[PDB]
Every structure is written in structure tokens, then in C-alpha cells.
Design an enzyme around this catalytic site. Structure first.
Site, mmCIF file in Angstrom:
data_model
loop_
_atom_site.group_PDB
_atom_site.id
_atom_site.type_symbol
_atom_site.label_atom_id
_atom_site.label_comp_id
_atom_site.label_asym_id
_atom_site.label_seq_id
_atom_site.Cartn_x
_atom_site.Cartn_y
_atom_site.Cartn_z
ATOM 1 N N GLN A 1 0.825 -1.204 0.000
ATOM 2 C CA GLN A 1 0.000 0.000 0.000
ATOM 3 C C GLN A 1 0.861 1.257 0.000
ATOM 4 O OE1 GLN A 1 -2.722 2.298 3.250
ATOM 5 N NE2 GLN A 1 -3.334 0.184 2.793
ATOM 6 N N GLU B 1 25.593 6.529 -11.020
ATOM 7 C CA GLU B 1 26.180 7.715 -10.411
ATOM 8 C C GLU B 1 25.707 7.922 -8.977
ATOM 9 O OE1 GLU B 1 26.307 10.422 -13.508
ATOM 10 O OE2 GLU B 1 27.771 11.795 -12.601
ATOM 11 N N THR C 1 3.575 -6.912 2.964
ATOM 12 C CA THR C 1 3.995 -6.989 1.571
ATOM 13 C C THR C 1 5.218 -6.118 1.319
ATOM 14 O OG1 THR C 1 1.720 -7.435 0.880
ATOM 15 C CG2 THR C 1 3.264 -6.668 -0.813
HETATM 16 N N1 GTP Z 1 4.085 7.690 3.818
HETATM 17 C C1 GTP Z 1 3.161 6.743 3.673
HETATM 18 N N2 GTP Z 1 3.185 5.639 4.495
HETATM 19 C C2 GTP Z 1 2.256 4.668 4.359
HETATM 20 C C3 GTP Z 1 1.265 4.765 3.398
HETATM 21 N N3 GTP Z 1 0.487 3.662 3.499
HETATM 22 C C4 GTP Z 1 0.965 2.878 4.492
HETATM 23 N N4 GTP Z 1 2.056 3.497 5.038
HETATM 24 C C5 GTP Z 1 2.902 2.996 6.129
HETATM 25 O O1 GTP Z 1 3.185 1.637 5.876
HETATM 26 C C6 GTP Z 1 3.199 0.892 7.074
HETATM 27 C C7 GTP Z 1 2.339 -0.353 6.896
HETATM 28 O O2 GTP Z 1 2.719 -0.998 5.702
HETATM 29 P P1 GTP Z 1 1.738 -1.125 4.430
HETATM 30 O O3 GTP Z 1 2.355 -0.506 3.195
HETATM 31 O O4 GTP Z 1 0.391 -0.505 4.732
HETATM 32 O O5 GTP Z 1 1.572 -2.725 4.294
HETATM 33 P P2 GTP Z 1 1.492 -3.481 2.873
HETATM 34 O O6 GTP Z 1 2.693 -3.163 2.016
HETATM 35 O O7 GTP Z 1 0.209 -3.119 2.161
HETATM 36 O O8 GTP Z 1 1.518 -5.056 3.237
HETATM 37 P P3 GTP Z 1 0.262 -5.842 3.885
HETATM 38 O O9 GTP Z 1 0.602 -6.261 5.299
HETATM 39 O O10 GTP Z 1 -0.007 -7.079 3.062
HETATM 40 O O11 GTP Z 1 -0.950 -4.938 3.892
HETATM 41 C C8 GTP Z 1 2.679 1.798 8.171
HETATM 42 O O12 GTP Z 1 3.768 2.148 8.989
HETATM 43 C C9 GTP Z 1 2.173 3.028 7.455
HETATM 44 O O13 GTP Z 1 2.499 4.195 8.165
HETATM 45 C C10 GTP Z 1 1.229 5.878 2.564
HETATM 46 O O14 GTP Z 1 0.354 5.986 1.702
HETATM 47 N N5 GTP Z 1 2.183 6.864 2.707
HETATM 48 MG MG MG Z 2 -1.954 -3.960 2.681
#
Ligand code: GTP
Ligand code: MG
Ligand code: ACP
Ligand code: GDP
Ligand code: HR8
Ligand code: CA
Ligand code: CA
Ligand code: CA
Ligand code: MG
Ligand code: MG
EC number: 3.6.5.-
Lengths: 352, 438, 425, 54
Positions: free
Chosen positions: B11, B254, B145
Site C-alpha cells: 500500500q 552515479e 507486503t
Molecule cells: N508515507 C506513507 N506511508 C504509508 C502509506 N500507506 C501505508 N504506510 C505505512 O506503511 C506501514 C504499513 O505498511 P503497508 O504498506 O500498509 O503494508 P502493505 O505493504 O500493504 O503489506 P500488507 O501487510 O499485506 O498490507 C505503516 O507504517 C504506514 O504508516 C502511505 O500511503 N504513505
Molecule cells: Mg496492505
């Protein structure tokens, strides 16, 4: 309800501040590893600054300025003076010092001998003192061969600086002494000097023809109470406070402590702390710092003040624990975590 | 010209990828339908922007990006969002159930059954590259993920694309915008298996992006949209050299040559300024010296730490807008005499400076105001190690009791892979201390 | 499309589950006939998590009703929302369980279990991606306890990688149907410790006292106790039924709430709880102070007697998300002695804009506290008070069981207590 | 305070300033790690089913 932790059980100072904080009923103590705290009374060495200021909703405050060791280490203080343009090498209130690394390990060996051979050729007094931070281990000798051979017998960094052969002697007694000033620096970097200092005096008459016996040359409170035979004779615990010392300067020398010495001390403290402000300030930092310092000074027979060293974790004179500790809570802690005079400090205004 | 493929995992990666490609398109004058009136070569060309965009016969400019998420809710935003027309379905890969914030689940369980699909989709984007440079991988440390599948994707990319560079944009976990307690585990698991596979990684601490939004943008409670719009500005400033005519940081190689003299220490700290609120009446435009001086304030760093108590290994200054070399040198001279900038003795005390005259593009209706000049500083400081200490410490608190460990072992992981990953961090903290402290 | 399958077993199980579907159906705008008549799109966003979509835009609760006697379920079908449940999903017998675990688990229940699993398998085969199951039941009776756990044991066999969630009403002598309730509860607790990922503990005494002392109900009824469970159930499931990132799906919630496989028993909590001064606006500080107060908790366990492993709060309604954080961070930083220090950030908070029916705003509390051991200590002490004399065992031995199986359940729960005890220090 | 390698183009310019001089796993082994974890899962689920059969 503000919360705080304690990570230095050996601190006689903040042990009292902790007793005072709880006496206010508005501060709660936590286990020494609970990260949810407002105030940390952290350890001396390897204090984990990197973990501070990362708790959502908590404004965190610590009692040590990260990087202040540059000022409270023998070799560090010397290196700071000779390199910082704010102090320059021609600094007038700091003894001619040199950093010497034992030969079993930059190093100012040859630079020290040059100034040493120029003094030996000019008939001038050539008595130097060797010391280091890893001491309770000091050697006072007029021969360069002894000073160097003494450091090589050790294994840590040392410092040789000019010994003040003309120190101011108290009477009666004809004895040496040093002056301790407690300075507090709050999160805003205001420099507060504690109006109460102490003179840790020597109970033995000063003898310039025998540096072998270091009981009349060293004014450390522990040395006088163990190797001195006149401990507590002229004053209680070899500790004369600013009131008696000020009366003496007027009866004997016809001057005041403020005019003859305190002005120079206030100048030194400002120049030392102002120098390193852009390196340790917590003005725009995610956490806030404040620290108590202990400066040690020398006074020659011309009423000039020399800077010996700075202590980062200083203790306090027994009689001054209550007044000083309470002051720390007023200007350093409550200023950031207010509770629901005639200040005991002397603010040293400066340009930030 | 040489192509760069972007990969967004999880995400965090996917949403951040959305904000960037929205930004890239505004900067290169690309419209939501992929059309580019300024591109006079229809259906081809090897211009600097072609490093990120291919071209179709119809004149569409299609990002060189792949979006991977084990759950379809976040990537569905892309298929129906404003820039749906940019991508084609092969570029967006989605599973049916996510990794539940479990690195083991993303890396082993789910990751094994979908890894061969991602590589194929990426292989399809590689077949359009006449001279692929490498990959930019956006992901999070905490997500199951972003952490679990990424480390696997990196292990395989280093096998299918040996000589290609790989850069990360990793999101550091910050409790203020996280509801997962096991994110330290994931971060330390993913850093271990990804370390020898990434050549340069720009960590972004959400805590930093969060406070910059509240302090500078007066956002009482910033949303992910807010954090991403800001993070896409930093990312844009870092990838600009690859997308625009220039002579500094012209290819991914680079980045390692200029910022990473030691392999393991490949985590440059990023500082950006100015961040000005669009709702403001009207701000006094900052000079070159004032914005450069701000690059050494902790409040503007992507990771909160104290560079004054570290040592610099490299340092770049990327300017955008009304800036000329004369002004850059003047500000640097004044900052050295005021700041504490200690370099390692085996590295020169210098700054590589790049200037792009086009000032930063601001997303219409966004939170950031239009400025005439802005800078982004990449400095490899041992002070960033503070971030690892924080993270490793939390890891020790939970691991000392084996909390939550059964969830990882249950997906096939061995309990030994924890300590093995932790010991790799303890070595990473040691290398930092061997380089910085005296 | 992350669907959940609902099972409700026994008298208590079905009367609570019924009111549960009454409450959320209202929140999603589903009338008693299955038609939608809401005014917001947030209602249907995550509607298919608990509802199936039939022809004519009808929404059918993905729920299975189970019992060994017809009585209770005949009332559900004639009840308020009774017409909304799928007719086939009524699986029931005629013998009853006589408040006997042995009957619901080995004899009567075993004769009807295959036919209930025929319906579960039918609801699952239609799920695009099944999250897991949630069972509502009591532990002191015979059907929800004896057969309920028998169903969980078999659903885990056929769906070993799906989350098993239960709302379990724990028995108390002050709110008792029969003296054998400690027997049935002790036997079920072992099944749950083995085959459930999450069990919301609901002590009927805690519900009774909240109605008597806090709600000023002079003479509570089972109906009054079920109003609380309805509201609570609506609360803890808000993360699942509306657009949210925090604790979105069942497995993610377990990964954040269960640091150890066997310590998965939660104390829920609701706020406000106001007696009929009911129109007064409730501030965010008030919501938080009450939400953590033990008198608002439904396990009948004093939290200040143990330590919190993890905590999940959920605030519903239009409010200041900035003021929520300030107050949550205030409660943690004012009582950090009751939170374990070896789990950083073990207190999460989620906001939802749709408040429950009749309230501008509310807060639901989900706690994984070691203080729950007090609940299993009561049940064990009551179990042993009778088993030491073998009192009432003949009801069970007559159904095939042996005294040894009782001695095992005894030692199994005393272990569970000892486990909650080492983590409190 | 030296400036070296000044490059100028239509869209900007870049240079360098010096203040002071100085003083993998193969595809076979990744499949094994993956299959090894898939094997430890299958074993644990067997013990669960074996337990459920008893
Ligand atoms: N800066 C920023 N951080 C994000 C965002 N979405 C999630 N996070 C951060 O990502 C962390 C959680 O990881 P996710 O990316 O939501 O998890 P995932 O990659 O979808 O993996 P899953 O467990 O399968 O859902 C948390 O610490 C959130 O603060 C975003 O849109 N922007
Ligand atoms: Mg997720
Ligand atoms: N250059 C010098 N000239 C004369 N005396 C000196 C001197 N340097 C040190 N001393 C003597 O040594 C004592 C201070 O020693 P130093 O401070 O170096 O060791 P130390 O740090 O263990 C004592 P403390 O930390 O308590 O101030 C003083 O009493 C002073 O009389
Ligand atoms: N909260 C609540 N508890 C109930 C209700 N009905 C029964 N109980 C409790 O459940 C236990 C008896 O379980 P019961 O449902 O009658 O057994 P079963 O129907 O044979 O499975 C007793 O401890 C009762 O206190 C109810 O409507 N609400
Ligand atoms: C055992 O019965 C109850 C247990 C709990 C509650 Cl809250 C109410 C009743 C009740 O209404 N009983 C009425 C009947 C005993 C005549
Ligand atoms: Ca072209
Ligand atoms: Ca490689
Ligand atoms: Ca029969
Ligand atoms: Mg000392
Ligand atoms: Mg009954």
C-alpha cells in the site's frame, strides 16, 4: 502528571532532584527502561541520545548536552581551545597546555619540548604538571624527562600544562586552593551561574621546593581528607564559601570577590559555553537538553583567574545541596513542565 | 538514453507511486490521457524524459512502472483514479488477501506463489528497454507486503538482472500513523535480506513527514495524501537528474559512485526546503543561502537525527528554480564557518551541486505553495544510524520475550532468521560507529 | 471482497446474535426485509463483509443459526428482523441439550453437526475470499458451549487457515440458570484455548452489574444484558464493516492483538453508558476516561490487577481526531504502570465517522489484559468446589464422558492461569 | 574554495566544490529456501490435522 526516569544511581545531585520532584506530587517515577517519560536523568557514558524525542505526544527533556564532552575532557578541552577561533591559541585565561599520547599508541610532543627549551633557556620557571581523565594519578616535575617517561608508563591520553608556580595563598596558612562554580544551562541556552561557589582549600602550607609531596599542591577534597594532616583546621572540610572569602579579600587585599575574581569567572564561562553553542544547542531539536557544569579555577598572586578544567557530572558542597537542587527544578525543569526570589542564579546574557 | 523501471510494492509503495507519477506528468507536461503536446517525436525518441516514459504509436506516454499489492483495494484506486489512462492492466498486479503485516507471509507463503508473475510482468517492461539502467523500488518497512515480498523481489531481481542497479525508497515505521505493533520485526527482517541487494536506499521516517506537515503546512492531523504529496516532491527532486537534461546523477550508477563509498552504508539522509503552506497569505521568498542553510536543520530532514554528531561521507545539493552557481558557493562558505560539518578523513570535504532551472511543480489544489527556488540535500551521515538504534532497540524489547514470534514461524519461517537478521543489524550499527565516532 | 461467515449457537448464542444483526443492519440501512434505505455510501462500501447480495438488490446476512431445540430459533424467525435470515440457514434439532456440554459435544450435537457444516460449506463456497468465522454463544449452557466448540473443532479441520473468532458469554453464579455452568464453561475454555484466534470474554455478572449500578435498571432481564452485547458487538466490528485502515481484516487484527497463541482472550468495553441526562453531549475526555474505567468493562476483571498486553480503541462519530490522540496519549502517559513495557506502541486507535444509532459519538474498547486470569480463576474455583465431591457428574458420565476428561480440563485451565501469571511480572 | 567540472546546458548546470582534501544467492538456493518454508508449514498443518483426527 509529568513522568521521569533515573539512569544514574550514583548521582548525588539528581538523587535530591528526584526526591524533590516526588515531593511536589505532580511528578511520577517510572522504571529506568520505560520510554514513556517527560524527563530523563540519564547515565554518564553512552547515554542513548538517539532514542530521545520519538514518543508521540510527549515533550522529552534530558539533563546532558550531547557533545559537551568536548569541554569536560582534559584532552578535548585543550583541543577545543587551540582550534576554536572564539578562543584562539593565544587564549589568556587558559594555561599553556599540550596533548601528549603515550609512545605505545595529533600528538604535541615536539611542540611541548620547543616551548620547554625556550623557557629553560630564558631562566623562566619551567614547572609543568601531567594529568589525565583516567585519574582518581598526577605528576608534578620541573624535568621534561620525568613527565614524558611518566606518561609512557601509562596507556591513555594525557595532558601537560604549565604549573601555576605563583598561586594565591591564603593567610594564615600559606596554602593553595581552587574555586568551584556551578553553572546551569537550560533548554533555551540561558547561562545561569550559581551565586554560591566553594573554595576547596589545602590544609598544608605551599612548598615550591618539593613537588614530590603533592598534598600541599593538589586541592582535591579527597586528597586533603586522606594524605593531609591539617584537614579541617582553618575551615570545615577545607571548604570556604563566598561570604568568608569575600571578607578576607577586603581585610587583606582591600578588594571584593566580585571585582577581583567573579568578573573573570563570568567571562570565562560565557566564552567556553558560547563557543560550543552551535554544536550542542537543542533549539530546533526534537528533544531538549539542559546540563549542570562544574568549573574549576586557579588564582595567581596577581589576582588573575586561570581555567583548570570543566566537570560534566559534578557533585555539590554538602551545605549547598538544597538551595542548588531546588533552583535546578525552577529554571531548568519547571520552565518546560510548569507546576500547578530573588533568583539564586546570575544570568549571563549573550548573543545566541 | 537508458531506461529506468519503477516498482511499487504494498500500500505505501503503491500510494506513493501514485503521487509521484501524478507529479512526473505535471512536470513533463503529460496529460492524464498520456498525451504530451511538447513531445515533437511521436511514437518514439530518446529524450531524457524517455528514461521514465515509453511512447505508443498513438502518442501516449506510458510510465515504466509496475504496481504490486497482495490485496486489490489500494491498486483499484489506480485503475479508476485520475491517471487510469496512463497504465495498462498488465502493469497493475493484485492478489486477493494481503500479508496481514507479517513479513514471513509476504516473503514465503504468499510471495512464493506470485513471485514468478511479477518477474514476468517486469520482464515485459524490460523488453521495451534498449539499455535498462536498473530499478527504483518503493515500499514500506512495516507492511507485510512492503517488507516481506520486497526482500524476495530484490533477491530475484539480482538474479535475473545481475549488472543492473537497484535503489529503494523505504518508508520507516512511525507509530503516529501506524496500527501495527510488529513493524520493527518486519523492518529488521527486510533490511537483512535486502541489504546485499540494494545499492542505495532513501529512508523516509513517517514521523518526519508527519511533523513537517503539522509544523509547516498547519495540518492538525495529516492524511496519507498529505504525507504522499510531500514525499513525492522529495522523490521528484531526487529522480529529476534522470528525467531532465543534465550532467550530475545522470544514471543510477552515479548515485552509488557519488553517495556510497562503502557498500553496506548505502542509506543517504535527505533534507528538503522550503516547505511552505499554500493557505498562507503570501510568503517572503527565501534566498539561496537561507534555503541551503535550512538543509542543516533537523526539522527538515526525512529522518530525525543529529548530523552534528556524525561524519559526512558524501554530500549533494540539488537545486530547482532561480539559482546560479555564484549564489550556491556564497551560502556554502557562510555555512561552514557557522555549522559543525565533520567529514571522514578518507573522503574529500566537498559538495557536488546540480541545478535545474525549472522550479518545483506543485500539484494544483495541493498543500504546498509555489516557490521560485528549492533545494534537496543528500548527505551520507553516520548520524542516520540513530534510526537503526531506535528500531533495533524495539526489536530487542519484543524479541526478548518472543512476542508475536509464533505468527512468523507459522508461515514457515525459522526462529533463527530473527537473531540472524538482528545480528546483521548489530553489525550495521558497528560499521556506522567505526566510521563516525573517534 | 473479504467475507465473514457468522454462526450463532444455542439459546444465548441466538438471542444475542439476533440483536446483533438488528443493530448493524440498522447501521448499514438494511430494513427487516433485506432492502437498503440508507443515505450514505459508506454503508455499502464494506457491506458484503457480513451480507450476501441476492436478486433485486436484497441483502441477506451471511449467518447460520444453530440450536438443538426449536424454541429459541422459532422466536428469532417470528422476531423483529427474523424475516431477513436465509430460511435454509436455520439448522436445529428437537431433543435439546439440557444445559449439558456432553450432550452438545458428543451425543445430540454430534448427530446434527454434519448438517450444520453442510450450510457453512455452502456459504463459504460463495465467498470470493473468506476471511474467517465468528461464533456467538454462551459457555455455561449445553448447545452453544458443547456443540459450539464442537463446530469450531470441525470448522478448523475443514478450514485450517481461516480466522476463528468468537463472542463467548461467560457464566456467573449471580446470573445463573443451572449449577453446572462452571462445568460447561471449563470444558469449552479448553477448546477455545486450542482452536480460536480471538475470544471476546463477556461475563454475565459484569453485564448484570452494569445494568444494575450504572444503568440504574432496578430489575435487569436477559434482554437488557443482550442490549449491551449488541452495542459491544457492533463496536468491535466497526473496523470490519466500514472503510478503515486500522485492524482492517480479521488476521491483521490477530497479528496485532495476540502476542502468544494461547493468550487470545479479550476484555471488551463500551462508552457511553448513560441512564435515562441522556441527551448531554459527551466530550472526548469523558469518552476516554469512561472507556478505560473497569465499570465500563464487560469481563468483570479489574484491569489494575494485571497488565495490558495490547489495546485497540475505536472512536465513532464526527469529532476532533487531534483531540482523540491528545486524550489517548494522555491515558497511556498517566497509567504506564499497567502496560507491559516490552511491547512498544501496544495501544492503537481508529476513528470512524458513522456513530451508532442514537449517539453523537462513542468509543469501543478491546483489551488483551492479563487481568482476565481472574475470570478463569473464578471458573476454576467453582469447577473444583463441585468436582472435588464429583457432584452432578452423573449428567455427563451418562453421556459417555469419564472423570479423567474433567481432570484434564481442570489442569488445562489452571495452566492457562499460570500462563497469564508469568507475563504479569 | 575551488569549483571543478562546471557543466552547463539549457535546463541548468552542475558543478563540484572542494573545501578541503582528504587525509548473492542463486535461483536454485532461493527456491530451496522457499520450498523449505513451504515444507515446515505442511508439517505443522499435518500435526494439527493428526491432532484433530485423534
Ligand atoms: N508515507 C506513507 N506511508 C504509508 C502509506 N500507506 C501505508 N504506510 C505505512 O506503511 C506501514 C504499513 O505498511 P503497508 O504498506 O500498509 O503494508 P502493505 O505493504 O500493504 O503489506 P500488507 O501487510 O499485506 O498490507 C505503516 O507504517 C504506514 O504508516 C502511505 O500511503 N504513505
Ligand atoms: Mg496492505
Ligand atoms: N596548571 C596547574 N597549575 C597549578 N595547579 C594545578 C594545575 N592543574 C591542576 N592543578 C591542581 O590540581 C587540582 C585539579 O586537578 P584536576 O582537575 O586536573 O584533576 P581532577 O579533575 O581529578 C580534580 P576535579 O575534577 O575534582 O576538579 C587543583 O586542586 C589544582 O590545585
Ligand atoms: N447475556 C445473555 N446470557 C444468556 C442469555 N440466555 C442464556 N444466557 C446465559 O447462558 C448460559 C446458559 O446457556 P444457554 O444458551 O441457555 O445454553 P444452550 O441454549 O443449551 O446452548 C447461562 O449462564 C445464562 O446466564 C441471554 O439472552 N443473554
Ligand atoms: C435466571 O434468570 C435471569 C438471569 C439473569 C437476568 Cl439479567 C434475568 C433473569 C430473569 O429475568 N429471570 C426471570 C425468572 C428467574 C423468573
Ligand atoms: Ca519522443
Ligand atoms: Ca547486486
Ligand atoms: Ca437421537
Ligand atoms: Mg575531574
Ligand atoms: Mg436455556
Amino acid at each position: 502528571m509529568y513522568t521521569f526516569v533515573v539512569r544514574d544511581e550514583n548521582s548525588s545531585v539528581y538523587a535530591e532532584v528526584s526526591r524533590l520532584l516526588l515531593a511536589t506530587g505532580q511528578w511520577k517515577r517510572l522504571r529506568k527502561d520505560n520510554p514513556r517519560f517527560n524527563l530523563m536523568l540519564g547515565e554518564r557514558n553512552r547515554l542513548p541520545f538517539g532514542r530521545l524525542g520519538h514518543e508521540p505526544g510527549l515533550v522529552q527533556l534530558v539533563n546532558y548536552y550531547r557533545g559537551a564532552d568536548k569541554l569536560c575532557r582534559k584532552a578535548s578541552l585543550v583541543k577545543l581551545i587551540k582550534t576554536s577561533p572564539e578562543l584562539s591559541e593565544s587564549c589568556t585565561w587558559f594555561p599553556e597546555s599540550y596533548v601528549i599520547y603515550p609512545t605505545n599508541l595529533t600528538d604535541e610532543r615536539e611542540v611541548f619540548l620547543a616551548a620547554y627549551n625556550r623557557r629553560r633557556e630564558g631562566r623562566e620557571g619551567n614547572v609543568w604538571i601531567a594529568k589525565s581523565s583516567a585519574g582518581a594519578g598526577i605528576l608534578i616535575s620541573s624535568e621534561a624527562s620525568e613527565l614524558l617517561d611518566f606518561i609512557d608508563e601509562q596507556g591513555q591520553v594525557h595532558v601537560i600544562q604549565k604549573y601555576l608556580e605563583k598561586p594565591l595563598l591564603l593567610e594564615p596558612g600559606h596554602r593553595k586552593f581552587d574555586i568551584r562554580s556551578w553553572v546551569l544551562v537550560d533548554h533555551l541556552y540561558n547561562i545561569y551561574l550559581y551565586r554560591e561557589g566553594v573554595l576547596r582549600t589545602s590544609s598544608e602550607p605551599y612548598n615550591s621546593a618539593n613537588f614530590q609531596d603533592k598534598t600541599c599542591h593538589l586541592t582535591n577534597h579527597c586528597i586533603q581528607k586522606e594524605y593531609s594532616k591539617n584537614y579541617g583546621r582553618y575551615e570545615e572540610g577545607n571548604e570556604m564559601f563566598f561570604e568568608e572569602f569575600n571578607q578576607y579579600l577586603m581585610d587583606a587585599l582591600n578588594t571584593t570577590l566580585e571585582n577581583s575574581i567573579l568578573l573573570q569567572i563570568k567571562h570565562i564561562i560565557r566564552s567556553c559555553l558560547m563557543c560550543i553553542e552551535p554544536a550542542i544547542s537543542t533549539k530546533h531539536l526534537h528533544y531538549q537538553s539542559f546540563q549542570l557544569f562544574g568549573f574549576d579555577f586557579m588564582v595567581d598572586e596577581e589576582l588573575k583567574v586561570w581555567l583548570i578544567e570543566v566537570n560534566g557530572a559534578p557533585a555539590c558542597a554538602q551545605k549547598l545541596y538544597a538551595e542548588l537542587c531546588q533552583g535546578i527544578v525552577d529554571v531548568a525543569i519547571s520552565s518546560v513542565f510548569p507546576l500547578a526570589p530573588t533568583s539564586i542564579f546570575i544570568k549571563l546574557h549573550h548573543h545566541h | 538514453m537508458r531506461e529506468c523501471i519503477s516498482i511499487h510494492v504494498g500500500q505505501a509503495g503503491v500510494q506513493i507511486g501514485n503521487a509521484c507519477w501524478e507529479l512526473y506528468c505535471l512536470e513533463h507536461g503529460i496529460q492524464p490521457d498520456g498525451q504530451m503536446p511538447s513531445d515533437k517525436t511521436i511514437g518514439g525518441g530518446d529524450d531524457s524524459f524517455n528514461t521514465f516514459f515509453s511512447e505508443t504509436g498513438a502518442g501516449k506516454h506510458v510510465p515504466r512502472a509496475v504496481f504490486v499489492d497482495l490485496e486489490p483495494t489500494v491498486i483499484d484506486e489506480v485503475r479508476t483514479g485520475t491517471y487510469r489512462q496512463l497504465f495498462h492492466p498488465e502493469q497493475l498486479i493484485t492478489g486477493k488477501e494481503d500479508a496481514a503485516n507479517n513479513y514471513a507471509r509476504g516473503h514465503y507463503t504468499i510471495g512464493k506463489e506470485i513471485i514468478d508473475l511479477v518477474l514476468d510482468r517486469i520482464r515485459k517492461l524490460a523488453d521495451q528497454c534498449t539499455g535498462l539502467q536498473g530499478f527504483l523500488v518503493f515500499h514500506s518497512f512495516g507492511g507485510g507486503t512492503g517488507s516481506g515480498f520486497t526482500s524476495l523481489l530484490m533477491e530475484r531481481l539480482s538474479v535475473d538482472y545481475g549488472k543492473k542497479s537497484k535503489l529503494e525508497f523505504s518508508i520507516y515505521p512511525a507509530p503516529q500513523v501506524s496500527t501495527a505493533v510488529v513493524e520493527p520485526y518486519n523492518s529488521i527482517l527486510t533490511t537483512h535480506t535486502t541489504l546485499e541487494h540494494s545499492d542505495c536506499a532513501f529512508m523516509v521516517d513517517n514521523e518526519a513527514i508527519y511533523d513537517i506537515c503539522r509544523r509547516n503546512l498547519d495540518i492538525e492531523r495529516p492524511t496519507y495524501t498529505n504525507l504522499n504529496r510531500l514525499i513525492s516532491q522529495i522523490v521528484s527532486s531526487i529522480t529529476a537528474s534522470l528525467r531532465f537534461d543534465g550532467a550530475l546523477n545522470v544514471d543510477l550508477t552515479e548515485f552509488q559512485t557519488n553517495l556510497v563509498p562503502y557498500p553496506r552504508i548505502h542509506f543517504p539522509l535527505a533534507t528538503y526546503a522550503p516547505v511552505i503552506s499554500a493557505e498562507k497569505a503570501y510568503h517572503e521568498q527565501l534566498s539561496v543561502a537561507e534555503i541551503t542553510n535550512a538543509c542543516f536543520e533537523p526539522a527538515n530532514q526525512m529522518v530525525k537525527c543529529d548530523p552534528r554528531h556524525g561524519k559526512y561521507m558524501a554530500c549533494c545539493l540539488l537545486y530547482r528554480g532561480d539559482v546560479v552557481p555564484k549564489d550556491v558557493n556564497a551560502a556554502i562558505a557562510t555555512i561552514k564557518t557557522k555549522r559543525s560539518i565533520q567529514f571522514v578523513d578518507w573522503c574529500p570535504t566537498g559538495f557536488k551541486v546540480g541545478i535545474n532551472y525549472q522550479p518545483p511543480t506543485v500539484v494544483p489544489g495541493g498543500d504546498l505553495a509555489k516557490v521560485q527556488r528549492a533545494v534537496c540535500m543528500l548527505s551520507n551521515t553516520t548520524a542516520i544510524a540513530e534510526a537503526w538504534a531506535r528500531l533495533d532497540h524495539k526489536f530487542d524489547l519484543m524479541y526478548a520475550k518472543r512476542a508475536f514470534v509464533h505468527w512468523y514461524v507459522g508461515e514457515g519461517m525459522e526462529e533463527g532468521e530473527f537473531s540472524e537478521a538482528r545480528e546483521d543489524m548489530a553489525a550495521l550499527e558497528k560499521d556506522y560507529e567505526e566510521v563516525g565516532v573517534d | 471482497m473479504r467475507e465473514i461467515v457468522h454462526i450463532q449457537a444455542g439459546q444465548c448464542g441466538n438471542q444475542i446474535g439476533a440483536k446483533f444483526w438488528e443493530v448493524i443492519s440498522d447501521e448499514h440501512g438494511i430494513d427487516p426485509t433485506g432492502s437498503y434505505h440508507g443515505d450514505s455510501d459508506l454503508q455499502l462500501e464494506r457491506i458484503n463483509v457480513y451480507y450476501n447480495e441476492a436478486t433485486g438488490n436484497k441483502y441477506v446476512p451471511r449467518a447460520i443459526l444453530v440450536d438443538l431445540e426449536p424454541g429459541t430459533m422459532d422466536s428469532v424467525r417470528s422476531g423483529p428482523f427474523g424475516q431477513i435470515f436465509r430460511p435454509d440457514n436455520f439448522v436445529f434439532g428437537q431433543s435439546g441439550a439440557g444445559n449439558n456440554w456432553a450432550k452438545g459435544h458428543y451425543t445430540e450435537g454430534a448427530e446434527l453437526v454434519d448438517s450444520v457444516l453442510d450450510v457453512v460449506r455452502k456459504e463459504s463456497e460463495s465467498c470470493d475470499c473468506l476471511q474467517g468465522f465468528q461464533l456467538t454463544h454462551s459457555l455455561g449452557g449445553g448447545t452453544g458451549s458443547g456443540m459450539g466448540t464442537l463446530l469450531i473443532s470441525k470448522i478448523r479441520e475443514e478450514y485450517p487457515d481461516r480466522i476463528m473468532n468468537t463472542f463467548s458469554v461467560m457464566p456467573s453464579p449471580k446470573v445463573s440458570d443451572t449449577v453446572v455452568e462452571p462445568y460447561n464453561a471449563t470444558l469449552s475454555v479448553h477448546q477455545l484455548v486450542e482452536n480460536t484466534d480471538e475470544t471476546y470474554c463477556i461475563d454475565n455478572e459484569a453485564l448484570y452489574d452494569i445494568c444494575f449500578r450504572t444503568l440504574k435498571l432496578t430489575t435487569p432481564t436477559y434482554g437488557d444484558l443482550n442490549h449491551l452485547v449488541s452495542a459491544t458487538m457492533s463496536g468491535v466490528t466497526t473496523c470490519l464493516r466500514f472503510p478503515g485502515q486500522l485492524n482492517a481484516d480479521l488476521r491483521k487484527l490477530a497479528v496485532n492483538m495476540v502476542p502468544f497463541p494461547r493468550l487470545h482472550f479479550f476484555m471488551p468495553g463500551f462508552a457511553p453508558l448513560t441512564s435515562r441526562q441522556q441527551y448531554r453531549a459527551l466530550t472526548v475526555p469523558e469518552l476516554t476516561q469512561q472507556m478505560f474505567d473497569s465499570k465500563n468493562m464487560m469481563a468483570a476483571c479489574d484491569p489494575r490487577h494485571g497488565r495490558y498486553l495490547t489495546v485497540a480503541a475505536i472512536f465513532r462519530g464526527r469529532m476532533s481526531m487531534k483531540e482523540v490522540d491528545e486524550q489517548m496519549l494522555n491515558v497511556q502517559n498517566k497509567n504506564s504502570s499497567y502496560f507491559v513495557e516490552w511491547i512498544p506502541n501496544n495501544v492503537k486507535t481508529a476513528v470512524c465517522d458513522i456513530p451508532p444509532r442514537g449517539l453523537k459519538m462513542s468509543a469501543t474498547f478491546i483489551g488483551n489484559s492479563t487481568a482476565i486470569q481472574e475470570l478463569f480463576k473464578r471458573i476454576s474455583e467453582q469447577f473444583t468446589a463441585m468436582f472435588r465431591r464429583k457432584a452432578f457428574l452423573h449428567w455427563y458420565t451418562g453421556e459417555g464422558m469419564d472423570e479423567m476428561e474433567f481432570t484434564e480440563a481442570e489442569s488445562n485451565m489452571n495452566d492457562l492461569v499460570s500462563e497469564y501469571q508469568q507475563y504479569q511480572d | 574554495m575551488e569549483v571543478i567540472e562546471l557543466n552547463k546546458c539549457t535546463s541548468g548546470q552542475s558543478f563540484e566544490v572542494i573545501l578541503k582534501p582528504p587525509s548473492d544467492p542463486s535461483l536454485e538456493e532461493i527456491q530451496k529456501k522457499l520450498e523449505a518454508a513451504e515444507e515446515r508449514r505442511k508439517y505443522q498443518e499435518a500435526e494439527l490435522l493428526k491432532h484433530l483426527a485423534e
